[PDB]
Design a protein around this ligand. Structure first.
Ligand SMILES: CCCCCCCCCCCCCCCCCC(=O)OC[C@H](COP(=O)([O-])OCC(O)COP(=O)([O-])OC[C@@H](COC(=O)CCCCCCCCCCCCCCCCC)OC(=O)CCCCCCCCCCCCCCCCC)OC(=O)CCCCCCCCCCCCCCCCC
Ligand SMILES: CCCCCCCCCCCCCCCCCC(=O)OC[C@H](COP(=O)([O-])OCC(O)COP(=O)([O-])OC[C@@H](COC(=O)CCCCCCCCCCCCCCCCC)OC(=O)CCCCCCCCCCCCCCCCC)OC(=O)CCCCCCCCCCCCCCCCC
Ligand SMILES: CCCCCCCCCCCCCCCCCC(=O)OC[C@H](COP(=O)([O-])OCC(O)COP(=O)([O-])OC[C@@H](COC(=O)CCCCCCCCCCCCCCCCC)OC(=O)CCCCCCCCCCCCCCCCC)OC(=O)CCCCCCCCCCCCCCCCC
Ligand SMILES: CCCCCCCCCCCCCCCC(=O)OC[C@H](COP(=O)(O)OCCN)OC(=O)CCCCCCCCCCCCCCC
Ligand SMILES: CCCCCCCCCCCCCCCC(=O)OC[C@H](COP(=O)(O)OCCN)OC(=O)CCCCCCCCCCCCCCC
Ligand SMILES: CCCCCCCCCCCCCCCC(=O)OC[C@H](COP(=O)(O)OCCN)OC(=O)CCCCCCCCCCCCCCC
Ligand SMILES: CCCCCCCCCCCCCCCC(=O)OC[C@H](COP(=O)(O)OCCN)OC(=O)CCCCCCCCCCCCCCC
Ligand SMILES: CCCCCCCCCCCCCCCC(=O)OC[C@H](COP(=O)(O)OCCN)OC(=O)CCCCCCCCCCCCCCC
Ligand code: HEM
Ligand code: HEM
Lengths: 126, 431, 55, 352, 352, 55
């Protein structure tokens, strides 16, 4: 319900700042480590809720190999949570592996839908 | 631009265009298929096709003339087009074989071959061309038992009782000097056309056409020519619209242009600025639609036609387009009016300003025949630019909001609901 | 599609009492079922409003 | 960058950028069709939705058409909106986005629709069979993509920057001021396009004669003959095409259609005889070739085809400037032949 | 009514009625396929369900096969059940019901399935194109019904009346007493069929050489050559067909398949090169005909040919009995050529 | 098809409690709903058998 252009806007303003980044990105790294989705073998873009048309178009536009890897990571997380264990520590996602891979597709679909409604509520100057 | 003069009996109209490479003259009568019985239906088709016989058109081809003709509801035209230096060869042809010496055209063994090919033509129309035959059935059920209900091509049961006596009787009753405009488009000048139509002393006939005893009245009705062996479902649906010389003529054209036309398979037809598309695109309700505003002398028609293969959701297609029609009465925006203004100016510009002078001859003949002159395109644009949102709302409250409709359908129209649900869709309960 | 079909409950209402295809030839003896449903509503409502006072 | 215009005191202008990028220049089969269906998708600076919804409010539409020689990018609009449309077409030529989601959602279903609508007409089948057996690897390329050889997205980008070059396009404007059009085509993105090579070859396209092909088909059956025409005898075959369909000939009731496709290096004369039953098509095509193997005096049809050529050069403005007066006689020589439909009852090239 | 049988001390018999009613003699395109798919439907006295149930309880199966020359009705069974299967085949030939509800429910979908699985192989597509361009309206008729010309039920009854005659069939039993079979094919309904005439010709089937056909196809690409063979040169092309697909040749890494179809009055040698990309099959077929146009000695492959001919005529005991001893050399003359698939990258006939 | 699908009532029972596709990951907190169903049946039955004696 907060669309990703707003999140990216705030995050780019934080990361492009010299002071704000050096205070806030350590807190975010500790937040990511405490969150513990990586221990179940999941990247964060497997966590986003997919039942809106924006994410349905982003998942439809995602390429084939990325979609197969995403489906495997999801099925592995379900089987892991079914047994109340974690994954072995060699099977955890590393920080370099936790890449934003769906985010350009989400940002493109959101810019498309925003331009769509701004051109549906278009008004002329006459 | 257009100039129009009146000779001893004939009105002459030209649209001179000196950058054209063909010139085109002809005669446009004022009695189309709305001046027939249900029993001589198809006489104007037989005159169109004996004017374009092979032995009548071979004589025109040896002189470099190309024949054309058009049967409509109100008018009918007979056009001879050629190179700009040979306008009097065309006037000579149109005189010596259509106007005065029409006894070789109406030969038996020419009438029989032409009647046979016209019968084959309408037989292949009635079973293969589905959107146009439901537009003709929408006309035949909206205006029933009044003269506007007649198909322009005629009828297979009607056409096989026709003889040459019927053709010459219609010729005596309607091919008259009081009923005809002589048109000239292309780069023929007006003074040369009047000088060569008074150089020859051309006279058509001298009577006056019979005046019809009843005017066309819109009857809210339906007709269902259902056929489960066809792939799609073709549905035309219309209200009574404006006739020509209305004050609401261009408002009806603009209100049809608001909802426009659509094709499901062209990618730039899915991106139009119509608010109906983001209701009918999610489940792919239709293949195409087009919103028309057909204007005649007596009455008119305003509505749409669709073809769809989603035969399970026809009723929601009808429901969504009629709930989009309701917005013209209640909540049509400024932007939809401006967009339809620009698209209507483009559509009228492509219709009138086109390279073909046969089409200009048909349009100029019908317009000058019905109202004595022709409205220019600049005046048409100044009448389109003056339409406001209040004009569209007033017109839609008059002609659209809670009015009787006429429906015609063929194909798999089991999913199409009855008259009363569709008619109750014509006015929403203010929500 | 229409909201009376897209909804969970309104499609039940639609499919039973709004868009439900009935044979066109059925006569007034086919109103007895709707009549019995009205009768059942009458009995239940009046029974509750009397059981508020019955011992 | 040949810019040409033609003024008029009227209301509708029409711009066209025509590129030598048709099927004749296609690298793989149907790349010209896929680039043509790609044409008006989104650019790097303006979406495809924004283009349509601003062109509707300015009062004009875009189209793009494919044939054997050209990819034509047409813009029909109200007369005093010209710089918007020259920048729109310049952006389409220079910077179009080429996204794979656009390939898989819009362009491939549009091309699949185009192929499925042209597949049902047996005259289009016979015409492309005729082109393919006459010219083999130039003009005889398939016109539409049908996926027999797989075209990637990189193939479409490579074809796009092969044919969208500054020497390979013309800009032609009906009802446009020519000075202002020339001022608006520079000071644009048609000045930044690569000055590539012009793909048109002034050679002769290496035809083949006596060939025959038979295609199974359900429905109407078509028998088609096809004759390649050089640059010299072009107008004799145009007079023949206008003579056979007019009322001057006794064969006009037997011929379904007859035309002459003209190019800058010759052309192809095609004749189609089509109906629903093979006995009539066989009888008719035997009568056509038995009458054309004897002479036909084409001199009655000269003024008629002068008019017809003026008519069909009103719509296009590609003038080929044909003589029509030195045309006296025709006699059929060698010809390629295509039978589409019930080919177990259509005649062979032996029997014609 | 030639009746021949070959006894054996063996548990399982088989019994074949072969009629000359295959696709060679089809009056309409695919009426033989529909009669073949119609064969073991119900007769007047016994339903098709009852035949299947009673034959299963007795222990045997029926089959009906269609090739170019024959329609074969085969019955495999346990040895002492012979007169049941004789009377079943006699009833199928004599009195089949020919009901429209059997045409539209069980026969037409089966034929549609047969054509839909034969379309997917480009080798069978190329083989029938080869037959059609070599022989035109004899053996060039299509094997399977595809509805290009509509075959009604009266056409199937007329074709069955034409070909199910007493002079047009052969009764051929294996592991069966010939005196018992000869007693059971009279004392039957095979002896009151109409004594018509045998449709086989003793002439030569009027071949055609130098022809070429190309059809587009999505999938594998097949380049095929085909050579019509007369009766006296049959053994040489069989030694060639077994030489080209054995290890004696340098070409069977390139040749996907090669065979020789033998009829009474000649045959057709077919060769197929098949791959998934067109450059491989193009260079392969160029190499095959370039080194078959120079000669080949086939006398190494004579004993191998005698072996393969023995193992492929062990099945049916009406073979052709070629000599194989006088074959030495082969040189490729003229031949018909078929491209299937990516036809604008496969070579043409004049490039071979 | 199976009789538990080819019925009217057993189709509903099958679709809701027999062949209902549940995510395999759901823990023991996804039993509270069937627990509330059991509780509701307990309340209704014991309340009816006490209303048989309540004045
Ligand atoms: C038995 C009951 C059968 C009722 C059948 C029926 O209502 O027709 C369905 C008919 C067909 O639905 P549709 O064409 O798919 O929907 C059209 C759109 O909703 C657009 O339709 P619309 O905008 O014309 O209808 C919207 C409607 C929606 O109604 C609301 O619920 C608000 O708003 C109102 O009707 C306002 C009415 C307020 C007066 C009611 C006074 C009651 C006391 O829809 C309606 O007629 C809605 C009217 C509601 C009347 C029934 C109210 C509840 C009765 C219990
Ligand atoms: C008095 C008879 C005069 C009319 C007459 O001769 O009818 C003969 C007529 C011959 O029957 P038919 O028309 O060949 O059969 C058609 C069916 O009756 C069905 O015909 P239908 O249902 O269309 O006709 C409705 C009929 C029967 O309508 C009903 O059965 C509805 C009953 C409403 C019940 C309302 C609540 C009941 C509360 C407890 C009582 O009501 C009428 O007869 C009205 C016509 C006056 O017999 C009746 O109409 C039965 C009337 C029973 C009262
Ligand atoms: C006894 C105290 C339990 C503490 C030791 C349990 C192990 C532990 O530290 O778990 C922390 C654990 C966090 O584990 P997690 O895997 O992160 O939690 C995932 C789900 O929350 C939980 O997913 P789940 O499927 O594991 O949920 C089962 C869970 C929760 O199950 C339920 O929620 C069922 C709730 C009651 C159902 C019956 C309702 C009766 C109605 C009246 C209730 C009146 C109150 O019940 C259990 O934890 C069973 C394992 C107990 C092992 C006992 C070890 C004792 C030391 C030796 O939190 C709990 O297990 C809470 C349950 C404690 C309830 C027992 C009192
Ligand atoms: C107060 C409610 C909101 C105002 C009503 C309104 O605004 O209704 C507008 C809606 C929308 O209707 P739609 O399906 O055409 O649009 C779909 C695209 N959004 O109609 C309805 O709710 C449906 C009415 C149901 C009628 C049946 C009711 C039977 C009850 C028994
Ligand atoms: C006893 C019956 C009492 C009924 C009281 C009404 C409760 C409605 C709760 C929904 C509130 C809400 O929050 O609903 C939210 C939904 C949103 O719908 P959406 O997500 O489809 O649209 C999302 C927007 N596009 O609006 C509705 O569905 C309106 C429902 C209409 C009311 C139902 C009336 C008919 C009920 C018939 C039930 C028949 C079954 C009976 C048992 C077999
Ligand atoms: C259990 C009881 C079973 C009884 C079933 C039948 C009774 C319900 C009838 C509702 C009619 C309706 O509410 O209809 C709604 C109609 C829709 O009109 P329309 O959409 O056709 O026109 C749409 C054109 N724009 O508004 C009306 O006509 C208004 C007049 C109806 C008067 C209703 C009288 C109420 C009687 C209560 C009876 C108590 C039960
Ligand atoms: C006892 C003998 C019965 C007849 C023999 C027999 O059991 O018949 C076996 C039948 C046959 O089923 P089939 O699929 O083989 O049908 C093949 C047809 N050709 O199976 C069944 O009945 C289906 C049983 C389904 C059980 C569902 C249980 C539901 C539990 C909840 C009940 C409702 C609670 C609501 C609160
Ligand atoms: C309000 C809405 C709620 C929605 C969810 C409701 C779901 C019901 C939850 C309540 C549990 C009911 C258990 C039914 C078990 C069953 O009937 O099992 C049926 C099983 C099927 O065995 P099988 O086919 O695996 O056999 C594999 C090889 N044939 O036979 C058994 O093993 C019998 C085992 C004994 C079961 C005794 C259960 C006693 C229940 C008491 C409490 C009742 C409340
Ligand atoms: C199925 C529908 C019902 C039927 C057929 C029905 C029938 C009856 C009948 C015949 C009586 C006797 C009336 C008399 O003779 O005076 C009665 C009485 C009564 N019913 Fe019902 N009833 C129904 C539903 C209900 C319901 C649902 C309630 C409670 C909520 C209820 C509450 C009562 C009460 C309180 C009486 C008390 C005596 C009286 O006031 O008449 N009824 N019922
Ligand atoms: C929704 C489910 C129900 C709930 C939550 C509920 C709740 C309660 C509660 C809290 C009490 C008070 C208990 C006490 O303190 O003594 C009570 C009493 C009672 N309930 Fe219910 N009840 C339910 C269903 C029913 C039903 C359906 C009936 C009738 C058939 C019923 C009949 C009674 C009666 C008769 C009492 C009387 C006092 C007693 O015996 O305890 N209950 N209920």
């Amino acid at each position: 319900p907060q669309s990703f252009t707003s999140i990216a806007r705030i995050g780019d303003y934080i990361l492009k700042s010299p002071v704000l980044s050096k205070l806030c990105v350590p807190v975010a790294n500790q937040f990511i480590n405490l969150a513990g989705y990586k221990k179940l073998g999941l990247k964060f873009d497997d966590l986003i809720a997919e039942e809106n048309p924006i994410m349905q178009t982003a998942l439809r536009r995602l390429p084939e190999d990325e979609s197969y890897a995403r489906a495997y990571r999801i099925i592995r997380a379900h089987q892991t949570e079914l047994t109340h264990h974690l994954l072995p520590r060699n099977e955890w996602i590393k920080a370099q592996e936790d890449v934003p891979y769906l985010l350009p597709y989400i940002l493109e679909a959101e810019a498309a839908a925003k331009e769509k409604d701004e051109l549906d509520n278009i008004e002329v100057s006459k | 631009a257009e100039v129009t003069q009146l000779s001893n009996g004939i009105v002459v109209a030209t649209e001179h265009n000196p950058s054209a490479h063909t010139a085109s003259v002809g005669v446009v009568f004022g009695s189309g298929a709305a001046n027939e019985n249900p029993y001589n239906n198809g006489v104007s088709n037989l005159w169109k096709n004996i004017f374009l016989s092979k032995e009548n058109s071979a004589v025109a081809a040896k002189e470099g003339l190309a024949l054309s003709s058009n049967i409509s509801r109100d008018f009918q035209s007979y056009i001879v087009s050629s190179l700009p230096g040979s306008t009097d060869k065309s006037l000579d042809f149109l005189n010596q074989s259509f106007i005065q010496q029409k006894a070789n055209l109406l030969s038996s063994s020419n009438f029989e071959a032409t009647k046979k090919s016209v019968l084959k033509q309408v037989q292949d129309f009635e079973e293969n061309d589905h959107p146009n035959r439901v537009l003709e059935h929408l006309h035949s059920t909206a205006f029933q038992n009044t003269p506007l209900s007649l198909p322009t091509r005629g009828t297979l049961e009607s056409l096989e009782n026709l003889v040459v006596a019927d053709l010459e009787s219609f010729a005596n009753n309607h091919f008259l000097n009081s009923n005809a405009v002589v048109v000239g488009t292309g780069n023929i000048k007006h003074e040369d056309l009047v000088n060569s139509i008074e150089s020859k002393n051309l006279s058509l006939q001298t009577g006056t056409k019979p005046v019809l005893k009843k005017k066309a009245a819109f009857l809210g009705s339906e007709v269902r020519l259902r056929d489960d062996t066809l792939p799609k479902a073709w549905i035309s649906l219309a209200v009574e619209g404006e006739p020509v010389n209305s004050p609401n003529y261009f408002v009806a054209k603009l209100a049809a242009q608001i909802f426009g036309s659509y094709n499901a398979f062209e990618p730039a037809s899915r991106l139009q600025g119509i608010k109906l598309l983001d209701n009918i695109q999610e489940y792919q309700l239709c293949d195409n639609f087009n919103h028309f505003s057909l204007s005649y002398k007596d009455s008119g028609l305003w509505g749409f036609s669709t073809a769809t293969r989603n035969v399970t959701m026809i009723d929601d297609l009808i429901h969504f387009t009629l709930k989009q029609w309701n917005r013209l009465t209640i909540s049509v925006t400024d932007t939809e009016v401006e967009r339809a203004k620009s698209l209507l100016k483009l559509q009228l510009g492509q219709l009138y300003e086109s390279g073909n002078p046969v089409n200009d001859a048909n349009l100029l003949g019908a317009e000058v025949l019905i109202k004595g002159s022709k409205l220019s395109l600049g005046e048409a644009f100044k009448k389109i630019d003056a339409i406001t949102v209040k004009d569209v709302k007033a017109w839609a409250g008059k002609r659209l909001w809670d009015q009787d409709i006429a429906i015609a359908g063929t194909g798999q129209i089991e999913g199409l609901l009855d008259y009363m649900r569709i008619r109750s869709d014509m006015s929403m309960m203010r929500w | 599609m229409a909201f009376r079909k897209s909804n969970v409950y309104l499609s039940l209402v639609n499919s039973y009492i709004i868009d439900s295809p009935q044979p066109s030839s059925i006569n007034y003896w086919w109103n007895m079922g709707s009549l019995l449903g009205l009768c059942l509503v009458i009995q239940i409502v009046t029974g509750i409003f009397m059981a508020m006072h019955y011992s | 960058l040949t810019v040409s215009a033609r003024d008029a005191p009227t209301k509708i202008s029409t711009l066209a950028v025509k590129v030598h990028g048709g099927s004749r220049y296609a690298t793989k089969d149907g790349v010209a069709h896929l680039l043509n269906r790609f044409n008006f998708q989104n650019t790097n600076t303006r979406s495809a939705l924004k283009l349509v919804r601003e062109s509707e409010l300015l009062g004009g539409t875009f189209k793009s058409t494919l044939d054997r020689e050209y990819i034509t990018l047409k813009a029909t609009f109200l007369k005093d909106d010209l710089p918007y449309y020259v920048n729109a077409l310049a952006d389409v030529l220079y910077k179009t986005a080429f996204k794979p989601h656009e390939l898989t959602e819009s362009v491939l279903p549009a091309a699949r629709y185009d192929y499925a609508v042209a597949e049902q007409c047996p005259v289009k089948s016979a015409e492309d069979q005729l082109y393919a057996i006459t010219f083999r690897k130039g003009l005889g390329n398939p016109l539409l993509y049908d996926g027999v050889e797989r075209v990637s997205l990189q193939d479409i980008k490579d074809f796009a920057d092969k044919v969208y070059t500054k020497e390979n396009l013309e800009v032609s404007g009906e009802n446009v001021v020519e000075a202002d059009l020339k001022r608006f085509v520079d000071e644009s993105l048609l000045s930044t396009l690569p000055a590539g090579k012009s793909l048109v070859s002034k050679s002769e396209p290496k035809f083949f004669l006596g060939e025959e092909n038979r295609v199974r088909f359900i429905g109407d059956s078509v028998a088609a003959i096809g004759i390649p025409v050089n640059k010299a005898s072009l107008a004799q075959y145009e007079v023949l095409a206008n003579y056979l369909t007019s009322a001057l000939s006794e064969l006009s009731g037997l011929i379904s259609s007859a035309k002459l496709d003209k190019f800058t290096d010759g052309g192809l004369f095609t004749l189609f005889v089509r109906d629903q039953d093979s006995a009539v098509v066989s009888s008719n095509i035997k009568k056509i070739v038995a009458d054309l193997k004897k002479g036909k005096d084409l001199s009655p049809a000269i003024n008629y085809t002068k008019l017809k050529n003026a008519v069909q050069n009103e719509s296009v403005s590609s003038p080929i400037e044909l003589n029509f007066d030195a045309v006296k006689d025709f006699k059929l020589g060698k010809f390629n032949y295509v039978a589409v439909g019930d080919v177990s009852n259509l005649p062979y090239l032996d029997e014609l």
